[PDB]
């Protein structure tokens, strides 16, 4: 005498929405939406990313004199460039199938850089010391790509060259080379005597004959000439043959490489740190179990679905009163 029956209430002010009522105060509630990141570029599997810093992919593999300080990590989960990395192809030209390479290079399981064609003992009928440019400066002194050699004629003679590498590694070998297109027919012979030359690269799958296109281009980094960059993957046991009567920028360093496909490239100012994460964005990492997130649409890893919502509050308790 008597017995009343009722429910709970507290000082809570958490509101949620329903199909029939908006802003309903309720005893308890959880959040389904993650909206918090650590503002750090973290490891992703268990392997840290590759940070290029001042340079971009192009400058990194070619060996631009400024990217001099970065190439060792034998594997990475993804690649990071800065929006203010401009050090790439210092000598104007076209990087064929560039963005594609970048994709292939986004994540790698093993990546060792070996000297494919040793500079000293490989080019015995050509000058391998005269190939520098003011476009690729190093120490105010003219320089060039570390991983490429700009073969010019040996004093009035550019004999047909023909070298070839056979992949004895136990994995794919990324090989990069270049074709130089002089601005004038005077520079053509000055560099490679012969006035009509041709370059041929061939493997078991690749085959392409290049013809120099001599003409005056508008000056880019003070060059009226151009230099196009090419790359290919050589299977294990397969060989690749270089042949040229001039205008060939030969490979000096190649890359033994094994690629675990399925990653990407992040262009961000966000500092790279020693932390584990299962999901990465350019603004930072996400450590969450929630089904949804509104931090960034571009994500890498096993991430929550990106949603436009500004709050996803799921009621657990009951009405307050």
């Amino acid at each position: 005498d008597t017995l009343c029956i009722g429910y709970h209430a507290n000082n809570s002010t958490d509101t949620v929405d329903t199909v029939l009522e908006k802003n309903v105060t309720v005893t308890h509630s959880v959040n389904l939406l993650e909206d918090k990141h650590n503002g750090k570029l973290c490891k992703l599997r268990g392997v840290a990313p590759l940070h290029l810093g001042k340079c971009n992919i192009a400058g990194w593999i070619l060996g631009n004199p400024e990217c001099e300080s970065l190439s060792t990590a034998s594997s990475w989960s993804y690649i990071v460039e800065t929006p203010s990395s401009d050090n790439g192809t210092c000598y104007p030209g076209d990087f064929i199938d560039y963005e594609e390479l970048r994709e292939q290079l986004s994540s790698v399981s093993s990546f060792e850089r070996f000297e494919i064609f040793p500079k000293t003992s490989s080019w015995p009928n050509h000058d391998s010391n005269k190939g520098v440019t003011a476009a690729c400066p190093h120490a105010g002194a003219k320089s060039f790509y570390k991983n490429l050699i700009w073969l010019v004629k040996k004093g009035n003679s550019y004999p047909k060259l023909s070298k070839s590498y056979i992949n004895d590694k136990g994995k794919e070998v990324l090989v990069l080379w270049g074709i130089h297109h002089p601005s004038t027919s005077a520079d053509q012979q000055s560099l490679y005597q012969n006035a009509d030359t041709y370059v041929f690269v061939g493997s078991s799958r690749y085959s392409k004959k290049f013809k120099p296109e001599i003409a005056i281009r508008p000056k880019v980094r003070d060059q009226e000439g151009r230099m196009n960059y090419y790359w290919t993957l050589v299977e294990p046991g397969d060989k690749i043959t270089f042949e040229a009567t001039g205008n060939l920028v030969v490979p000096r360093y190649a890359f033994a490489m094994e690629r675990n496909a399925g990653s990407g490239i992040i262009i961000s100012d966000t500092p790279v740190h020693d932390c584990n994460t299962t999901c990465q964005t350019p603004k930072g990492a996400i450590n969450t179990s929630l089904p949804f997130q509104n931090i960034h649409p571009i994500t890498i890893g096993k991430c929550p679905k990106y949603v436009k919502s500004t709050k996803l509050r799921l009621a657990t308790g009951l009405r307050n009163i």
Binding site: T2, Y7, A9, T316, L318
Partner: protein, 162 residues
């Protein structure tokens, strides 16, 4: 509001009761006291928890890297890619927005059901021995001591009285 109990014929809630979601407030000679129904509260907590752990745990995603790179001569497939990202954006945003609206409505009705169900479960135990005020409260027609209430909230309530 779907079962008429919560915010219905039982207007407010008890800031007093702090042991569970659902309970009682007895008022005999021994004294007054708020006591939350253990079993009922414990069952709801177990089910609501499972509910949240369903909406969350059923979202198993794949390891993929959204975002791709295209040159100035690939604006189309760049826009195709953008279309795929915006399509998935509208689909997930909408369903997540609605999934919450519906499961919110349902959850509140779940608690309403649990309260009403509790009201009925006691009201059919002691039919004549008490009268319905109409405010979710009953007024006993006989002395109900602490061990009398115990047998009502216990589900073991005998009926040899007037």
């Amino acid at each position: 509001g779907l079962f008429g109990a919560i915010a219905g014929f039982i207007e407010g809630g008890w800031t007093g009761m702090v042991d569970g979601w659902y309970g009682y407030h007895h008022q005999n000679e021994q004294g007054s006291g708020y006591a939350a129904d253990l079993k009922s509260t414990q069952n709801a907590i177990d089910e609501i928890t499972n509910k949240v752990n369903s909406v969350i745990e059923k979202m198993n995603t794949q390891f993929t890297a959204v975002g791709k790179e295209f040159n100035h001569l690939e604006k189309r497939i760049e826009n195709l890619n953008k279309k795929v990202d915006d399509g998935f954006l509208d689909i997930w945003t909408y369903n997540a927005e609605l999934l919450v609206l519906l499961e919110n409505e349902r959850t509140l009705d779940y608690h309403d059901s649990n309260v009403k169900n509790l009201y009925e479960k006691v009201r059919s135990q002691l039919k004549n021995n008490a009268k319905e005020i109409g405010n979710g409260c009953f007024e006993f027609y006989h002395k109900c001591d602490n061990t009398c209430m115990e047998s009502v909230k216990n589900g073991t309530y005998d009926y040899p009285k007037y």
